[PDB]
A and B are shown apart, each in its own frame.
Chain A
């Protein structure tokens, strides 16, 4: 039906906004970004980064072995004997 007059019911809330032409669109971006970027990344890093780290180890090891076992053509069993 109608999506704007019928969403929900909201009592007692004031909002205050300003016009685009009165304000700036780039509010101390370097300054906010660093600290905000920093503050969320550091709350992400722990939850996100691990598994990727893990994959990297597994990638690294996993390729070493291959090259070894295959390049170590004598790996399985020695030559002299």
Chain B
């Protein structure tokens, strides 16, 4: 029954996305992830392109952070372009482990 409410979250979502500064840094949502054991394995599963990309992005980002400089307005990550490229990989890794856990009950 979500037509008005859930077509307006995108409004807070959008707000929120640009609120969090990582937008400005040239980074994307997936690169802001807490690198834990599941993320880690997902990470490892990335293709050369995807994966080298995430290395430059973070390189460019930690460079900016070191210099306290924001990227130009023209070169920023736009919410409409949400590459959730880790998501696919990350899901399974979890999926596998949930299974493993479950299989270990009895």
Which of B3-11, B51-59, B78-86 participates in binding chain A? B51-59
CA distance A8 to B70 in the complex (A): 26
Number of interface residues of B (CB under 8 A): 9
Residues on B with beta carbons closer than 8 Å to the beta carbon of A12: 52, 56
Instruction: Encode contact with A along B65-77: 1 for CB under 8 Å, 0 otherwise.
Output: 0001110000000
Nearest residue (CB) in B for A40 is: B68
Residue A18 is within 8 A (CB to CB) of chain B in the complex: no
Contact A43 B52 (CB under 8 A): no
Q: Let me know if B48 is at the binding interface, CB within 8 A.
A: yes
Task: Flag if A36 contacts B56 (CB, 8 Å).
Answer: no
Binding site secondary structure of chain A: mixed
Report Cα–Cα, A15/B68, bound state, in Å: 19
Select which of B21, B59, B69, B70 is within 8 A of A13 by beta carbon.
B59
Could you tell me if B55 and A36 are in contact, using CB atoms closer than 8 angstroms?
no
> 11 other contacts beyond A13-B56, A40-B68, A43-B21, with CB at 8 A cut-off?
A8-B55, A10-B52, A10-B55, A11-B52, A11-B55, A12-B52, A12-B56, A13-B55, A13-B59, A36-B68, A36-B69
Question: A residues engaging B (CB < 8 A)?
Answer: 8, 10-13, 36, 39-40, 43
